[PDB]
Design a protein around this ligand. Structure first.
Ligand SMILES: Cc1cc2nc3c(=O)[nH]c(=O)nc-3n(C[C@H](O)[C@H](O)[C@H](O)COP(=O)(O)O)c2cc1C
Ligand SMILES: Cc1cc2nc3c(=O)[nH]c(=O)nc-3n(C[C@H](O)[C@H](O)[C@H](O)COP(=O)(O)O)c2cc1C
Ligand SMILES: Cc1cc2nc3c(=O)[nH]c(=O)nc-3n(C[C@H](O)[C@H](O)[C@H](O)COP(=O)(O)O)c2cc1C
Ligand SMILES: Cc1cc2nc3c(=O)[nH]c(=O)nc-3n(C[C@H](O)[C@H](O)[C@H](O)COP(=O)(O)O)c2cc1C
Ligand SMILES: O=C(O)[C@@H](O)c1ccc(O)cc1
Ligand SMILES: O=C(O)[C@@H](O)c1ccc(O)cc1
Ligand SMILES: O=C(O)[C@@H](O)c1ccc(O)cc1
Ligand SMILES: O=C(O)[C@@H](O)c1ccc(O)cc1
Ligand SMILES: O=C(O)[C@@H](O)c1ccc(O)cc1
Ligand SMILES: O=C(O)[C@@H](O)c1ccc(O)cc1
Ligand SMILES: O=C(O)[C@@H](O)c1ccc(O)cc1
Ligand SMILES: O=C(O)[C@@H](O)c1ccc(O)cc1
Lengths: 335, 335, 335, 335
């Protein structure tokens, strides 16, 4: 029985090979941004409300035309067969059963059509390829397979400097492949427009940190953004998304959904993100800890724990709905 | 001989069973709010005044129609027989002898009538029960028994996630029971009004952190509030009461008594709370350390030590009265 | 050869009995104010000036009608025979030879007349006694013996709670006595006026932290103040003097000399104090480390080291005089 | 293969004699300014831009009439034969090959003419000598030998207090000499004018921290300044250059080039400096680590690594040029 997400990290470190744990845990450069994602959440304190009606507390949201059970989705994480033989299928099944959106990756180790066939109304994460037509074909494949949103990753013109991976000499095992293929080009605003013109699905730009990039995303017709430094894996020294979130929420002024990720490790952290104005969060590494530890059942247990922590935090803060949580105030503290 | 409250924690850890010490010491979740209560006090520095008349320094206050010997009351702590066989009777006797109000709990391990019979003009802490009539009956019992205030706990719609208790598998021993009974409903503003209509006693709302909840408490006819995050035991990530206190004192503008709790560990901390505008503080865990260490005599020694530290701090700060201490200025520092 | 003041603390800890080292090193309560004195200096950074004329750098000041070789005096420290058999005579001789004022204490372990006979134009520190006439007699004795200023300590209505001393059971050895006597009353503004009326010497109020107490000191006819929390030995939680200094300097607006003490451990710290607006600093514990380590010669070496560090810091900061150092700007940093 | 600059420090500590490593690593006094240079960079976070054209990312700048391959030059470091037998020649050759300016020192252990003969369009660092004519002769020698800028060090009226060197009893080995000679006077604004009148080369004032000294530098006809606390080696307690940089850039308002140094340890740090407004950075200690570890080849590898890290950071931040990097915004964080 896991009582916190930290129980799952401990379990994952026990089971995973060192170099795979490092691929998962690590960030770029000195890992300043990786650590800052945690620091940034730990400095935020919530000002809870008391004495409100909690007779029907609901953690549900509506996002991109679907009801989700929590203000949370599984972040795109490449190559999930690194962590468990069932890889993406195990995670997608658990997410479906929990009513949480699952983000299918361009670099999934099981094909996007197979993962979509699990059900649960999935999203699809896009990397822009040097061959543009390949990019747009992936989008069409995703849409044909029933994916509900295109999560266009905009903070990877190329991969950051992963010093753990360099020092370990990390490479994919022969049994883990990019199953959507039988090489990255930097994406631009023109690429965003090409995607927006090629699909009826909401386009969500993942990796926005500058306020004017958030504004431009709305002007470009994005249905959402994810305020994110890519888990500290891209620019080392990039500001945490949680530190830009409030300013971005104010600037977009309801023009698109504003998600955040990086370091969400509890329902309390979800509450903090919501109180800062997020529509929803993504959770990355902890989902992989659960997958590594106990496969589909592990992910189920993680999502059940997160669901309980979110409900607990919301009610203790006087919030019968996620909208009420967005109206909570916060105060910065120390360490 | 104890020269600081930390001497008492050391003594309590030596004697108490691990799981009972954890029940006492612990907070919810990651214990962020528990630690922050201490951090928040440690960052506050007092700007003392010099050269004032100290020929009759008094630490007394008038609160809820009684003179108290210190600007302090014993916080409500459930199930005091966990810590010593005499439980609530030992603590209430020592509080009476020291001239400090004692808060009798809804979940007292000795009946409220027995504890009230000790004397010392006691307060009564109320949890709202699913059976409303039971709640109001407790209030009437408390009033009939001579309790002087109803401390309505408003931050426990349900109990927080106590991970130490979960990991220890903590349960009450068979010899510790809720002696007022022969199950919690979330309280609302309607519940507050039902209590206010059922008693002539001052109603004090314990667990207020939002400024508008403090204002609403005054509008609702509360005689006081306790600005509190429940010792870090309820919402993990709730702001410390000490960080909201000044803003709350300004907002209520003398409309009710404003108490604070969480992490008060010395007379200097009492002085800080007073300088930030508190009418009085509650002290929880240290009273239980003293009870565990040496029963009634332990609590007596703790209160004597606190009394000396409060007098010392006040005089060194140029304050002949608690009112003068409330007019002291403060300055935030680091670590 | 000592190259920093920290070399002297190490030497003093080696030689002194534990309880005497604790009497010297310790503060009140949790020692929060003791530690904060150091933290407060460490957070201040100087913005040095370049390319200024340094052909005649002088560290001299004029204060209370005497030229001093440095913007520094030896703080009042009671019972110096605790640290070395020559006690106050050793320190006073070294201070005289270095051109630094020495503060003779009310609780000196050698009589004030003997210490004054050393020469060097000494100051006299006054504690207010329950017998007022005794207080004023000490002032007259000091003036008759050639003391140049009365340093009236205003932050000791009684002694703070010295937990190291309590735990050690510290008491003076039989061979250390208060040599000025053959019991403290709290001083008030009336006491200050009684002293001011009884002497032509400048009266300096030591232990001022509140801005309005600094203003009142000027209105009361004080020739100076020492902005000070008594080395963290009095109110535990009192703000460091260095944190109030700039605001106090602005408020008194040249109306009296403004000294500071607490945690000065280098010439760089002297420069910081000067840049924040101090006329001069007092140095306490390090002078006693030097006395303990090597008697008069130790104090000589300490003052020579401090003199070199002050000259070094001033010149590197582009300051040919202490007045120029007072015009330096500062910036707060972290840790 | 080195993947970070920290790999090079480890390698240098392994090979160098302790006292030489200390000469290199150390700062003045308590090393507060040395540590603060690192702290100051670690607190700065970049707000990257996304989705910009990165088809021709260039790290080049034009400075003092030459194209440089990076916004970086090798800082002046005296006596490079302390670290490797080839000393300055090894470093200058690697800098030339990398297209990075190299600063030839007044206290070079190989003559300035020999180092200039390496090629690569070098700069010359000037210390003001007690014999003025000697100073101006060095300038003329430098200009005759093809140096492109005079980097006048303005923060060394004399050497700071290097406690590591004092404790080690550090002295130059007999085989390391000041090769430009067959003693320092404090420089003033008059000295700057004498240099400016004696050369057509741009004069760059190294060691400026005060905003009005930056303004005065422009008024005095400086072509650049280096905002610097001399690597924490001069005034202990001097503010880090990185903390003054933004204010200085605003004040000079394009009137001269504004460089910064102190603690640059990665391409990410270069990006931070650029985002705060620097034209370029200097790098000191890491170049010497590389020299100690592996001579010319070591310095080559260091500069290749820095070049890759700068390109990586710029592109991840959406910057196709250094000018675009200067337009990035930053946000302060914690630890
Ligand atoms: C092992 C790993 C692989 C990832 N792969 C991708 C990816 O292919 N596409 C993408 O947009 N983000 C990717 N991310 C970033 C995550 O979507 C997310 O931004 C980050 O993990 C969130 O932080 P968290 O792990 O702290 O919850 C990856 C993260 C990790 C740890
Ligand atoms: C073991 C324990 C039991 C508690 N029981 C109650 C309770 O029944 N009702 C209540 O309002 N507060 C309860 N509290 C909270 C305290 O009244 C108080 O808010 C908190 O302990 C103050 O912080 P301190 O312990 O840091 O002094 C309890 C606290 C502890 C540690
Ligand atoms: C052992 C000791 C004895 C002291 N005695 C006196 C005293 O008799 N009168 C007084 O005004 N201050 C006294 N002080 C306070 C000092 O004058 C001074 O405020 C403090 O030591 C300055 O801080 P520093 O020790 O950090 O330099 C004493 C301090 C110490 C450490
Ligand atoms: C061993 C050593 C010698 C130095 N010699 C000189 C010098 O002769 N002239 C000068 O202007 N700066 C000198 N500096 C300062 C550097 O130019 C530069 O300001 C500092 O090293 C930059 O910080 P960094 O080492 O953190 O990169 C020296 C620094 C070191 C570490
Ligand atoms: O300034 C803010 O309030 C915001 O940028 C912020 C959010 C989280 C945090 O930890 C620090 C700052
Ligand atoms: O963070 C990752 O590992 C993932 O986003 C990624 C995978 C391949 C790649 O080229 C760049 C990024
Ligand atoms: O802003 C304040 O002054 C107040 O919120 C506060 C009180 C105590 C504290 O530690 C930090 C902040
Ligand atoms: O903090 C506690 O333990 C106390 O307030 C409490 C007791 C029972 C309960 O259901 C909720 C809270
Ligand atoms: O606010 C200030 O500048 C002043 O109070 C201060 C001085 C020193 C210090 O460390 C912190 C604050
Ligand atoms: O700090 C001290 O020890 C000194 O100021 C002092 C001495 C005797 C006393 O009663 C009070 C203070
Ligand atoms: O105030 C600022 O923004 C600037 O002085 C600064 C730069 C870097 C830093 O770490 C702290 C402050
Ligand atoms: O930092 C140094 O070591 C260098 O700048 C220097 C060399 C000789 C000197 O006299 C002063 C400074």
């Amino acid at each position: 029985t896991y009582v916190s997400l930290a129980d799952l990290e401990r379990a994952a470190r026990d089971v995973l090979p060192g170099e795979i744990f490092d691929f998962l845990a690590g960030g770029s450069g000195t890992e300043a941004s990786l650590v800052a994602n945690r620091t940034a959440l730990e400095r935020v304190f919530v000002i809870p409300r008391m004495l409100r009606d909690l007779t029907d507390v609901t953690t549900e949201i509506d996002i991109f035309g679907r009801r989700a059970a929590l203000p949370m989705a599984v972040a795109p994480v490449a190559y999930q067969r690194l962590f468990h033989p069932e890889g993406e299928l195990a995670v997608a099944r658990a997410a479906r059963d929990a009513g949480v959106p699952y983000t299918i990756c361009t670099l999934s180790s099981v094909s996007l059509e197979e993962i979509a066939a699990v059900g649960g109304r999935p999203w699809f994460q896009l990397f822009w390829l040097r061959d543009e037509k390949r990019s747009l074909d992936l989008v069409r494949r995703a849409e044909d397979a029933g994916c509900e949103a295109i999560v266009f990753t905009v903070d990877v013109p190329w991969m950051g400097r992963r010093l753990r991976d360099m020092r370990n000499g990390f490479a994919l095992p022969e049994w883990v492949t990019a199953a959507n293929f039988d090489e990255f080009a930097p994406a631009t605003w023109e690429s965003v427009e090409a995607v927006r013109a090629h699909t009826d699905l909401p386009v969500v730009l993942k990796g926005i940190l500058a306020v004017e990039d958030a504004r431009r995303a709305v002007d470009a017709g994005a249905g959402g953004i994810v305020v994110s430094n890519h888990g500290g894996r891209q620019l080392d020294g990039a500001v945490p998304g949680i530190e830009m979130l409030g300013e971005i929420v104010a600037a977009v002024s309801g023009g698109c959904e504003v998600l955040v990720d990086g370091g969400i490790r509890s329902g309390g952290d979800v509450l903090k993100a919501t109180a800062l104005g997020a529509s929803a969060v993504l959770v990355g590494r902890p989902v992989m800890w659960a997958l590594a530890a106990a496969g589909q059942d592990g992910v189920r247990q993680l999502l059940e724990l997160l669901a309980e922590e979110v409900r607990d935090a919301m009610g203790l803060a006087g919030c019968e709905s996620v909208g009420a949580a967005r109206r909570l105030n916060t105060k910065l503290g120390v360490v």
